[PDB]
Structures are given as structure tokens and as C-alpha cells.
Amino acid sequence: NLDIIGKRIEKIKQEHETSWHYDQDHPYKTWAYHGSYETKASSMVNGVVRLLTKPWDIIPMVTQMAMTKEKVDTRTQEPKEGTKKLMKITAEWLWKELGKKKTPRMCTREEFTRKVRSNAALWKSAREAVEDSGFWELVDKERNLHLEGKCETCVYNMMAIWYMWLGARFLEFEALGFLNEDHWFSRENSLSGVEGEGLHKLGYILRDVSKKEGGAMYADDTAGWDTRITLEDLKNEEMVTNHMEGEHKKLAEAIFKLTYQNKVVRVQRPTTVMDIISRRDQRGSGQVVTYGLNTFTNMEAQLIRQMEGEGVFKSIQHLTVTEEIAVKNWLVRVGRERLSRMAISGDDCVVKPLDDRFASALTALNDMGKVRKDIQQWEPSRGWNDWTQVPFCSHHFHELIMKDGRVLVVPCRNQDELIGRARISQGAGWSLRETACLGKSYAQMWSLMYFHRRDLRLAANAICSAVPSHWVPTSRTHEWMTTEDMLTVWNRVWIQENPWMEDKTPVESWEEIPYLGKREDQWCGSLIGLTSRATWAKNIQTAINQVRSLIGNEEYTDYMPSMKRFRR
């Protein structure tokens, strides 16, 4: 406890020694409180996307999205010894499989610097600190302190997103960045994972899982996954260090011990004082390490749920000596096959188990604290009989046959959600040019991922017609972030580079690229058939001209005649 976090706490105490006060009216039960001190971000609308989607101005599901804890301050119980054993055996085996064709390695100041230049989500800005050299001296001090087994400045800031100072992020990136930078959770490497795979590949992956013999597809969400990470989970995650050596092992061990398995956080409370609180359990790391370790622990949880359904062990209360031999031998004999029956993206999963015994195999899942969302604790899971109805990564997936017989598996979600998000820009000081270029990024994403939705292909063509042809899409895989012809990009992604497409014959026109059935488009939220939508489509050039007149005398390209109706 206080020996590991005290130094961090002792340092913040002094930088505010003229405000420190052990407040007796503090709202924490499960978080340890240490003291307070005196201290003191809305969704803006994207005017270019909103002027080109007028029919949606009167649709509350779109317009309410731009307007405007219980779970964080809860406690998870210690799993039983059978559960703790199931996890340790499974984790040990999983780090070895993930490590068979990969080498753990430190990420570098050079790599870290390149990422800060490219606007990755990780002195005014980071760019400046990286150029400066005192920062790196500060980094060096902490780094040598971590080699000593002590921490001074690796403190979280709550807002649930856990901002640290850039120096702490580098030390995180140094030891643990390899998980993401070297694609440990790629499908090729982890078999369950989809890291780097892209939204145009997730549907094909779900359809490949569907091809396996077995029961329903299960897609159970965990209620507040990050808050249900136990200290036993953090200790199985720490076992990645068993595969490291030299400095790297030491540095990785310090991240896990000092920043993950012990945490110090500063919270804005309005009553305005800053609460220096600590706790051991729960997920609190950087987003990228959070994504990879969530994937890891989810793959582990789901293999164990699969073991329970298949009768590999009888009870979580305690594993017999022989049951350990059985688990290990299961993992050795069928482990890789069982991983291939899953698609796991952080806390999000789809599992096609051997049979439907999986549906009521709930003792390990509940005892690990991975409690299902929106279903009673002991009520069996409801599975999906058709891969095209399975939810994954906020989407479902359609099978769409081209006029030439080739098969597209395309991503889809309710259209209100897509238009509502396109109409929102985060941050201050956006110029008209920067707002336009963000609208162009949404438009090009729609042309590539959602071309099959009538409204989005028409709105995408309108935004690309309204924004100067050579302006570069911005956002403060992502193939839509380019100035290349979207037809050329479409042909690369869907035909040339698509391993599910045998016939590589290029498409020569947007008109060869199909839509969903008209009824299926309305089911997924299309306005096709409404008078508002008909007036919008008929008069689109008037909307395009409005936005061109606001931006001014620039070079523009008409993309509307790419669609049959506007082709005279």
C-alpha cells in the first residue's frame, strides 16, 4: 500500500501545501481518499454536414445526439480458488501461444516522437515537449526510479479516460507498446483477435466463424468491463513479463506493479477541490494497452466459459489435481481450434461454441466478475441463429450480391447513428476549411463502408461535391483518409486486397456497386419513400451550391452524375 503510492502522494501534497485538507464529507467508499486541494468540453455541430442532410433536422434521434459515478465506485469480490487456478493455467498457456511467433521488445523515443507528430491519441502540446530535452531528463529520472522499484510522477487524471502527463505515457509506451505496434492481437497471431483487421473485414470474419459446426453464436456484453477487472486479472496480465529480459522485463514489471496494480488518481469534485484517491483493482491504463489487455483477459474468460460448457471441470469451488491435467490437455489439444471460434475486440466478443451447453455455463463467468449486461445473473444467454443478425463493434453485417454474382459482406448500423455522429465536431477554433475537411472524411468513410445505404451514398456524393476537390480529409484501418479517387480505393479494398474475393475483375463505375434491398434499407433507418427525402434528393445541387457559396471561389468537382438518377 502506502510505501508504493506515498511518494507520488507526498509530492502532490507540497505543490498545494497551502490548500491541503483531509475533507470529512468525501464521497468515496471503494476508492481510498488521501486529501483535497483548491482548483478550477461539449459536442459542436459540423455545419457543412448539417446543411447537406436537411431531412434529418426534424429527426430527434439525430438532433438529440448533439445536445447535453454508480459503477466506478463499486467493488468486485475475490474469485474462488478453482476460478483463480482456471485463469492462471489459461493465462500462462495464452501468453505462450501469443509469444510463439513474436518477440517482446522496447518501443523507442524515436517511435514515440513519430506517433506524437501523426496526431495519435496519446510545454503546450506533446510536439513541443518531444522536441525539448529537459522532458527527456525528467523521463530519465522517473525511468531510473522505476528501475529502483519506486514512482514519483505516474498519476492518473479522471474525466472513463485516465489522462497522464506525456512522460508517464512514454514509460507505458516504452515497455508495453509492442503489444499494439507488433500486432499481438492480429487475427493471424491470436486467432480470436481482430486488431488491425478493419470494418470491411469484420463481416467476412463473422461469416467464417459461422461455417464451424456448433451451436448458436453468442454475443453477451459485460456490464462495465473496465470496473470488473480484478487484481487476479492484473496478475495474469503481468505474466507477459515472464517472456521478456534485461531492462525491458524490469521496466514492464514496474508499469504493472507501480501504475496498474497500484493507482493514484486526481478527480474534479464540484463541492471545486481535487481528490487524490488510490485503489489497486479495475482497468486504468492508456487506451491502446487497455484495448490489448481487455482483448487478452476476454479471450481467457471466453475459453474458460467454453471449458465449463464442455464439462472440462466440474466446479469452480476447487480444481482437483487431475482436473488441472485435463484443462492443460484441453488447451494443448483443442485450444487453438477454440480460439478460432471467437471474434474478440477488447471487451466485445462473439463465440460459436461446440454446442449450446455454453448458454447456461455461467458459474466461472459470474465468479470472474464478468457479469452479463441486461439479463438476470443465472438466466441462460440468448444466442443468434444467423451471423447476419449478430451485433459486433457497434455494427451488424449484410451479404450483398453484385449484379456480376460476386459476394460483398458489408458493415451496417442504424442510419440515424451514422448521420448524427457525422454532424458533430469535437474541439474549439475550427476554421471553415477544417470543418469542411472533417465533413469530407465522414463522406469518404460512407462511400467506402456504407455505399450500400441509398441516403449515405447520395449525401457522401453531395459533401464531396461541396468541398474543394483537392482539400485533404482531416480528423483531429482508415483507407478513406486520402485524396485518391474513391472508386480506385473502393476497387483496392473490396476486390484487389479482399482475400474472400477470387475474381479480381475491377469495377469501372459506381453504378456496378449494389445497394441493400429497398425494404432492408428502410429497416436499417433509410428515409427512402418520405417526401422530405424526395425533395432533398431532387434539389441536392441547390444544397451543394449553398455550401460552395459559403466556402467561396475554389475548384469543385461534381460527383452527383456518378449516380444513375443524376446521369441525365
Ligand X SMILES: Nc1cccnc1-n1cccc1
For residue 226, say whether it is annotated as part of any ligand binding site.
yes
Partner touching 85 among ligand X, Cl ion, Zn ion, none, CB below 5 to 8 Å by kind: none
Using the rule CB under 6 A, is 393 a contact of ligand X? yes
For residue 373, say whether it is annotated as part of any ligand binding site.
yes
Least distance CB 500 / Cl ion (angstroms): 22
R_g over Cα of the chain: 26
Cα distance between residue 288 and residue 553, in whole Å: 42
Using the rule CB under 6 A, is 443 a contact of ligand X? no
Cα distance between residue 235 and residue 421, in whole Å: 38
Please provide the DSSP assignment of 111-158 as one string.
HHHHHHHTT-----SHHHHHH-SHHHHHHHHHHHHHHHT--SS--EEE
# residues contacting Cl ion (CB under 5 A): 4
Least distance CB 451 / ligand X (angstroms): 12
# residues contacting ligand X (CB under 6 A): 19
> Which residues from 373-412 bind Cl ion, rule CB under 5 A?
384-386, 389
Query: Which amino acid is present at 396?
Result: H
Partner touching 449 among Cl ion, ligand X, Zn ion, none, CB below 5 to 8 Å by kind: ligand X
Give the SS3 label for residue 89: helix
| Backbone phi, psi, residue 348, to 5° | -105, 130
CB 392 within 8 A of CB 345: yes
Cα distance between residue 88 and residue 233, in whole Å: 9
- Bridge partners (DSSP) of residue 278 are 32, 264
Binding string to ligand X for residues 94 to 133, with x set by CB under 6 A, is what? ---------------------x----xxx-----------
From candidates 139, 145, 166, 199, binder to ligand X by CB under 6 A? 199
For residue 398, say whether it is annotated as part of any ligand binding site.
yes
Cα distance between residue 281 and residue 234, in whole Å: 8
Which CB atom, from 62 or from 412, has the smaller least distance to Zn ion?
Answer: 412
Partner touching 524 among Zn ion, ligand X, Cl ion, none, CB below 5 to 8 Å by kind: Zn ion
CB 257 within 8 A of CB 154: no
Using the rule CB under 6 A, is 173 a contact of ligand X? yes
Binding site for Zn ion (CB under 5 A): 142, 151, 154, 412, 524
Using the rule CB under 6 A, is 172 a contact of ligand X? yes
For residue 142, say whether it is annotated as part of any ligand binding site.
yes
- Bridge partners (DSSP) of residue 36 are 21
Answer positive or negative: Cα dihedral of 474, 478, 483, 485.
negative
CB 469 within 8 A of CB 555: yes
From candidates 19, 119, 271, 394, binder to ligand X by CB under 6 A? 394
Count the neighbouring beta carbons within 10 Å of the beta carbon of residue 65: 16
For residue 524, say whether it is annotated as part of any ligand binding site.
yes
- The residues binding Cl ion (CB under 5 A) are 384-386, 389
Residues placed in the known binding site for Zn(2+): 142, 146, 151, 154, 396, 398, 412, 524
Residues placed in the known binding site: 142, 146, 151, 154, 221-222, 224-226, 294, 347-348, 373, 396, 398, 412, 524
- The residues binding ligand X (CB under 6 A) are 115, 120-122, 169, 172-173, 177, 180-181, 199, 286-289, 393-394, 445, 449
